[PDB]
Amino acid sequence: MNLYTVIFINILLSLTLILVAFWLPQRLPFSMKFFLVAITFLLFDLEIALLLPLPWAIQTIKTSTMMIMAFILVTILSLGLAYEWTQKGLEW
């Protein structure tokens, strides 16, 4: 609720401005590169997700498995990047 209170004031402040602002005064751009980036972005964005729980997982009793897992994830994605570089990708 406290957040809700703050946020609605936040929208209100902005809608107030635009309203006064409008009331006081009284086709084929495409490059696979761009699409490709967006894609890569999510592949990385998803990975960010699988990496986000790492702060809670640090405290996991295993530890060895934690790091073994996390290191494998970071390494396999980075190799994905590596092949992106090797291929024309990331070379715009």
């Binding site: 495409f30 699409f35 894609i39 999510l42 964005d45 997700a49 699988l50």
Partner: protein
Amino acid sequence: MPSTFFNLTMAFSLSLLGTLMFRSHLMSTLLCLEGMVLSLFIMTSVTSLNSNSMSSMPIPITILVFAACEAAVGLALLVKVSNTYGTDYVQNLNLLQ
């Protein structure tokens, strides 16, 4: 959840009715397709959360990770189509008749 899991379920059916009746742009389907994954993600997370079943929270996310790539593939097909036909319009996709 008794009736809060019926809204989400009908959301998935309203999204179901969407993906199944195409109209012009293909993107609207894909986009719709995603509306389901959100509804599934929300429902899976909701019940896992009120069953206190923490062993299952992995799933709500595995669902999203697989769904994201699934969509990545879907959009690359879409880009491939408006590279071959200049539009995403489905009617164009009628050569295999």
